[PDB]
């Protein structure tokens, strides 16, 4: 199937004393494999999946070096952004950066991303062609021109089409027993009377991987969205995910209703009934 690698970075300025709180996480698909936290004791990039522990000391030295450089970049950014936006020293502010690559089923380059936010709003982002920038406002437009001057897009494009996909390929092989395995949802239905006249039917999907899934209700074989509640997909805590969808129905009429589940790990979709 198709796969991705993503790194996420958050810096939060700490006015009054010290450097920002900095947190960096790396993912293959929906699996976190590395982390850095400026507040943790090690001051090293740290493993978070068993299959990355294969990597030698040179890997960890190299990653620690780059990630700490990311944190310094963001430290400088927070100062610069403060001046661009005429903000005071008294407030705490946030920068966030995300980048990575997708690969198709043949594990060849599909897409690359690099995007950036200040205080939770779009700031600047690399466009799909990986050749140009989307700058949200005039502060970001000044950044756009600096980055054009410094050939940032060319440097990123080399990384996203080269290094990113090469290492993703490597991680997929090393971690194949978990990363290349699909866990189909474990499904069941529950019934909860709400009054003498109505009942909730709840359709559960448990222990699935990857996170992407579709849960829908049908009534008499037609799609039903009214009187339905769909919760956001949530981590079980063990690496897998959970979701449910619920519908309110007239009691006695439960049999008209069917729950439909689509997931990468199911050859064909599932249908549940009460």
């Amino acid at each position: 199937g198709s796969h991705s690698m993503r790194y996420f970075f958050t810096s939060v300025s700490r006015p009054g004393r010290g450097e920002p709180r900095f947190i960096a996480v790396g993912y293959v698909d929906d699996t976190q494999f590395v982390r850095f936290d400026s507040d943790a004791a090690s001051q090293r990039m740290e493993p978070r999946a068993p299959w990355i522990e294969q990597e030698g000391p040179e890997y960890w030295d190299g990653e620690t070096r780059k990630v700490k450089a990311h944190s310094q970049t963001h430290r400088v950014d927070l100062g610069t952004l403060r001046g661009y936006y005429n903000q005071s020293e008294a407030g705490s502010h946030t920068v966030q950066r995300m980048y990575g690559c997708d690969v198709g089923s043949d594990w060849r380059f599909l897409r690359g991303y690099h995007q950036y936010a200040y205080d939770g709003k779009d700031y600047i982002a690399l466009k799909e062609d990986l050749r140009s920038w989307t700058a949200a406002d005039m502060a970001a437009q000044t950044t756009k021109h600096k980055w054009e001057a410094a050939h940032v897009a060319e440097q990123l494009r080399a990384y996203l089409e080269g290094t990113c996909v090469e290492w993703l390929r490597r991680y997929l092989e090393n971690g194949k027993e978990t990363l290349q395995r699909t866990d189909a949802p474990k499904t069941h239905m529950t019934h909860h009377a709400v009054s003498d006249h109505e009942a909730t039917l709840r359709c559960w999907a448990l222990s699935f991987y990857p996170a992407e899934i579709t849960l829908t209700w049908q009534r008499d074989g037609e799609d039903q969205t009214q009187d339905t509640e769909l919760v956001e997909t949530r981590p079980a805590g063990d690496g897998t995910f959970q979701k449910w969808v619920a519908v309110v129905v007239p009691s006695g009429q439960e049999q008209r209703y069917t729950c439909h589940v689509q997931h990468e790990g199911l050859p064909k979709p599932l249908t549940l009934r009460w």
């Binding site: 190299g62 990311h70 970001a140 440097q155 990123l156």
Partner: peptide, 10 residues
Amino acid sequence: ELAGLGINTV
């Protein structure tokens, strides 16, 4: 693996 170059200050 993380990017090195391409990650510039704003």
